[PDB]
Ligand binder design. Structure first.
Ligand SMILES: CCNC(=O)c1n[nH]c(-c2cc(Cl)c(O)cc2O)c1-c1ccc(OC)cc1
Ligand SMILES: CCNC(=O)c1n[nH]c(-c2cc(Cl)c(O)cc2O)c1-c1ccc(OC)cc1
Lengths: 208, 208
């Protein structure tokens, strides 16, 4: 049912750098994950331009933000192109090995962690606030998978038989104990307004 | 030999807005075109991860900047994934119709033209400095095409029989008469250093 994989050495090193570096401006994770959602949404939209049946799995192109104080999770859902099993395994559709190398040569040259997205590995900023991350995804050319990691050098992939989602990607952030401010409506609103004001898809902040 | 197409109404409107709006910070075009080259390069690299024969048409992943004062052109070449004929026709692989709409709702809300790339239509900033633009491209799954436009509502596409390039995209900017500062080594260097310092591919500035 569940396969376990090792992160390539460079990705594991990126993940330790994000987890262990003292760095206070953690809120940029939300921008990186929304921006990722926007890229996936752009992709399904571009595909629908020549093949409208690509949208048979859902015409709505949007991003939802769902906080849950009881489970201590912030979930980001989008109706973008989604990922195949192979995409999930190859670093969630990123060029993360070379992107990590570039990012680290910048960090030497003075840059800081807020610029991680410029190197294509913005996802991993999720580990600034999350102790575990679960990625649930559905691409038109494959079944629904769940990817999951709590860092420490490994991730899992399983075929997800739970809630079918049609098409897209759901990112569930199991928040660190001292990071529950990102479940507060006021705070999420503030971050979205600050860093994500010109995203070309509706972003709905669910309430509790 | 040569097909002529009309820009969708919204793209034509974007192109008039870029050409006719008084706006002095024109140098951002280079950043947008390099960043486009970087995205294409990321794509061929991601593809090679699972199918290394994708790089049979060239293993080198780079961006060259070639000024020519005699022809009055700045050319940007990259060895990225390239575009099929259909990509060229569908707004150079962009979601330009919806991206233009978003960009224009931002311009109402106070944003300026330097943020065009946040809406996926950064290419068209080329018309801040160029009176004509020629895009020559080669994707693994198709032949070599040349796209061309001097705005005014139309572009052409032809199958390019001239210099074969293996794989990638070449953007040739026929500069406006008052915009020849972007052929000066000092100036191009300055712009690349300012706006394009963390691009994960070597950028070579050719000399004359
Ligand atoms: C290749 C076809 N699929 C995709 O590209 C895709 N599909 N879903 C996502 C995606 C990834 C993350 Cl991490 C996220 O938070 C949201 C997403 O939609 C992505 C995705 C993958 C890689 C990215 O690198 C910047 C950004 C988004
Ligand atoms: C779908 C497969 N091909 C590509 O995506 C592609 N190939 N070459 C380019 C490209 C486009 C421009 Cl305008 C440029 O200046 C440089 C490029 O490499 C692109 C490209 C297309 C769209 C883009 O939108 C941001 C950015 C780059």
């Amino acid at each position: 049912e569940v396969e376990t994989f090792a992160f390539q050495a460079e990705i594991a090193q990126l993940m330790s750098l994000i987890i262990n570096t003292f760095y206070s401006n953690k809120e940029i994770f939300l921008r990186e994950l929304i921006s990722n959602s926007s890229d996936a949404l752009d992709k399904i939209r571009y595909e629908s331009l020549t093949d409208p049946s690509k949208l048979d799995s859902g015409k709505e192109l949007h991003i939802n933000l769902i906080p849950n104080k009881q489970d201590r999770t912030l979930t980001i859902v989008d109706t973008g192109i989604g990922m195949t099993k192979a995409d999930l395994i190859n670093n969630l559709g990123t060029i993360a090995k070379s992107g990590t190398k570039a990012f680290m040569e910048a960090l030497q040259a003075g840059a800081d962690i807020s610029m991680i997205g410029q190197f294509g590995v913005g996802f991993y900023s999720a580990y600034l606030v999350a102790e575990k991350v679960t990625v649930i995804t559905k691409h038109n050319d494959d079944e629904q998978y769940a990817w999951e990691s709590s860092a420490g050098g490994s991730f899992t992939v399983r075929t997800d038989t739970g809630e079918p989602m049609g098409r897209g990607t759901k990112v569930i952030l199991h928040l660190k104990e001292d990071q529950t401010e990102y479940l507060e409506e006021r705070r999420i609103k503030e971050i979205v307004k600050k860093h994500s004001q010109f995203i070309g898809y509706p972003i709905t902040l669910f309430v509790e």
